[PDB]
Design a protein around this ligand. Structure first.
Ligand SMILES: [Cl-]
Ligand SMILES: [Cl-]
Length: 253
C-alpha cells in the first residue's frame, strides 16, 4: 500500500536548515497534498524526492526500494516524474512538441532535456503516444498550437501531459493550479482523479485550498522544514485545518 516514504530527510543550504528530518508515507493511488507558509521547505522537499536536490541526510524509498539521491534520469526507470513549469523557449513551441521534449532525456527537466536543441524528436512512435495523451487530456485540437498562446490552466494541463509521456506510477506536482481560473482548476484536478483511477499516485504542493481540498485524500502541513501536522481523510483534514497552531503559522510576521 505505501508506495513512497522518506526517512528523516535533511537538506542544508549553506548553514540554513531548509528541511529537518522529514519523514512521510504516501500510499499507492493516493492524492497527497502538502501545505505550509512560504519558507517551510515544501518545494525543497519535493525537489529532493524528484532528484533535483541531494538529500544531505535521510533516505527516500519508492516501493520499498532505496532510491535516495538518484538522478531524475534514473528515477524515471522507477516510475517517478515531476511536472515542470514551462520556460519561454518552450512557449514558442507547439503543444505536441511540449509533450515530445519529455522523450529526449526521460525524467529530466525541459531545459536539461533541451540541451539536445531543435532536436525535438518527431518519431512516429513517440508522437502516437503524445496524441494518445493529448487525447486523454482532451487537447488534441490544440496539438498544433504554440504553447505560449494557451491559457494558464491549459498550459498546466500540457505539463501534466509532458509527464505522462514517461508512463509514471507517481506524479509529483508543485502547485498545479496556482493562477488557474476555478473552472479550469477543478477540471485539471478532475483529470487527476481520472488518473488516480488508473492507479497513478500524486504528491502535490498547493496554496488555494478553496478548490483543492475536495480532491486530496492525505494532507501534511509543513513549517520550518518539518512536518508539523498530518491528516488522512476528510474528517482528520477538517480537524487539521481547524487546529489553531496551523492558522497561526499564517498570522504574525
Ligand atoms: Cl544538491
Ligand atoms: Cl492564485
Amino acid at each position: 500500500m505505501e508506495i513512497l516514504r522518506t526517512e528523516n530527510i535533511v537538506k542544508y543550504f549553506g548553514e540554513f536548515k531548509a528541511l529537518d528530518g522529514v519523514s512521510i508515507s504516501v500510499n499507492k493511488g493516493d492524492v497527497t497534498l502538502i501545505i505550509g507558509p512560504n519558507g517551510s521547505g515544501k518545494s525543497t522537499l519535493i525537489n529532493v524526492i524528484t532528484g533535483f536536490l541531494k538529500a544531505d541526510e535521510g533516505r527516500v524509498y519508492f516501493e520499498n526500494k532505496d532510491i535516495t539521491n538518484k538522478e531524475p534520469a534514473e528515477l524515471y526507470h522507477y516510475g517517478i516524474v515531476r511536472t515542470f513549469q514551462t520556460p519561454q523557449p518552450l512557449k514558442e513551441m507547439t503543444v505536441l512538441e511540449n509533450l515530445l521534449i519529455g522523450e529526449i532525456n526521460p525524467g529530466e527537466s525541459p531545459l536539461n532535456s533541451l540541451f539536445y536543441k531543435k532536436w525535438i524528436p518527431k518519431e512516429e512512435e513517440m508522437v502516437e503516444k503524445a496524441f494518445k495523451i493529448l487525447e486523454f487530456l482532451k487537447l488534441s485540437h490544440l496539438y498544433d498550437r504554440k504553447a505560449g498562446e494557451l491559457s494558464g490552466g491549459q498550459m498546466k494541463l500540457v505539463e501534466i501531459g509532458r509527464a505522462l509521456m514517461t508512463n509514471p506510477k507517481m506524479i509529483v506536482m508543485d502547485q498545479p493550479i496556482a493562477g488557474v481560473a476555478p473552472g479550469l482548476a477543478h477540471d485539471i484536478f478532475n483529470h487527476v482523479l481520472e488518473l488516480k483511477a488508473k492507479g497513478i499516485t500524486f504528491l502535490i504542493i498547493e496554496h488555494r485550498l478553496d478548490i483543492v481540498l475536495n480532491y486530496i485524500d492525505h494532507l501534511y502541513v509543513m513549517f520550518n522544514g518539518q512536518i508539523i501536522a498530518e491528516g488522512r481523510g476528510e474528517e482528520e483534514i477538517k480537524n487539521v485545518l481547524s487546529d489553531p497552531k496551523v492558522v497561526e503559522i499564517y498570522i504574525g510576521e
